[PDB]
Amino acid sequence: STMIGRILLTVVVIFRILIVAIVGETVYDDEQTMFVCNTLQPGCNQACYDRAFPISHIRYWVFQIIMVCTPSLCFITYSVHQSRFYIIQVVFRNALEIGFLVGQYFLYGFSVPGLYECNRYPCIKEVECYVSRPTEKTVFLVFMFAVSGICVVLNLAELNHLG
Template identity: 50%
Template sequence: MGEWAFLGSLLDAVQLQSPLVGRLWLVVMLIFRILVLATVGGAVFEDEQEEFVCNTLQPGCRQTCYDRAFPVSHYRFWLFHILLLSAPPVLFVIYSVHRAGKEAGGADAGPGPPPRRRCYLLSVALRLLAELAFLAGQALLYGFRVAPHFACAGPPCPHTVDCFVSRPTEKTVFVLFYFAVGLLSALLSVAELGHLLWKGRPRARRCRQGAERDGRRHRAREEARQLRPPPPVPPSRPRRPDPCGPPAYAHAAPAGDSEGGSGRSKASLATVRLDLAI
């Protein structure tokens, strides 16, 4: 039971990302498959080869007839079935742990939940395909009934040999039970896949509508910015007088006045010189 407990612990980690339908699938997987096969299946099918009796003593005839009656043992077929069904959820757990490590380290290049959701959708789809393939394989290999008598002919048997299966009714009940559990598991996988796809449609629509709304707001802001008049130029502040410069009342004389004043001073100077000469 150690290997089953390890597999069950890995599958328990899937329920953190699973919806209600996915958790129901895990319950069916853990209880009606792993637990039943580990406790009852081994006891029912462990002696099928030893108890397969044929009415001949020809060496090798009984082994050849058993191989023709059961190309693959029921128990090993279901064991491989469980391992293959558990592969997609376990891979999803590994991916989620890796993704969480990248997000914690700050090395994530994009948003976390959408890629994780797509990975979970892929795991559910692969799980459903594996379930349907094994249901078809079980129906083709064994049918729905374990016959108590099997007639075998061909080498190394010298003639037609009658072989008998131990506990055929009990094995038939177990085969039907396991096939019914497979159908239930497939239906749960279909329901979970449809639920995830239907739940993702409103979210994608909301994201698309939000992006369109943001785009419209951005375009409206750009258009309003282009139509807006330019801002008024603020009035210039008066310059403060320089304390080291000339006073405010000292204005420069006009050019004409300065020239006139210089002319008058020259005329008065010439008059003074004329008086002195006289």
Template identity: 40%
Template structure:
């Protein structure tokens, strides 16, 4: 797999992200992608060959391994990384759409194509929601597939074609358990960052909307005061002239 391609995509998003979004990107690169490439692949290397049962019945080990590990944990982790990173591509595509629209009309349509406002703000918020949902979904999937966030030393299997209850041993269970805890912790941190950034964007939008509305109301009140003052000034000379004639 080309992790450089994923890095290039996320680097493009970094230009349009908030400060919290840049922290999320750093966490993904340092604590997830680098750890996966440098260490995790080696820990789960040839895990099926290192899965041993105390019986040599043909097909028994394969069936038991498939039962307890329906999806390789390290491959599921790689899929999780891809899925939680893909929504960020929506922001890059939206900015590219703005730039292409300006070229097509041959005029300046936006103050800055990367400014977080209007449709781009909505796209960014939607990408945050998708990333958070994917994180929650994969944590739930991990929990359901493996019966919790744990890697046992010994599993007991009685699947066919095993003739009886068989003891099977998982290789490097402690090391794999530590990595699994690390995956859960980084996923939780990413969820926290996504939710924090989402609340920050909503708060900033509401504040901006309130200030704009407040400024508009002040401007309208000022116009009404000027109109009232002008009317009063017009009425006074007319009243004075009428009194003089009388």
């Protein structure tokens, strides 16, 4: 019952990592080339794009994948050079993944709107801008949040048993 969950964690991790490496890289290719605003101003496309999407979805997910696999790198490299390390590494993984999930919800939310209203310099008054591919990016948002939730839950399976 409790033993197999490790199989589930490993498989969702590698799954999680190749959806994000083979699918996500090309939904987000033309983000800024196909982002258009309704103005004649130079430099308002750049301002309003950077205000709407300060850090892209896929950069945050790459960093979140790499950062929650660093504790394992420590646990491997300690073994090669040679259980108190084990529990520490597990609690640190749990803390990192919860912090990253809640930071995700607070950065992005649950949706990607199709319109944005922008009032940064050099734009005059407020302007309207149009996102390219909002429904696919919404589906990807919700899929990553669900997988993140599943691994949060399964990591919390192991915590209670030994702790």
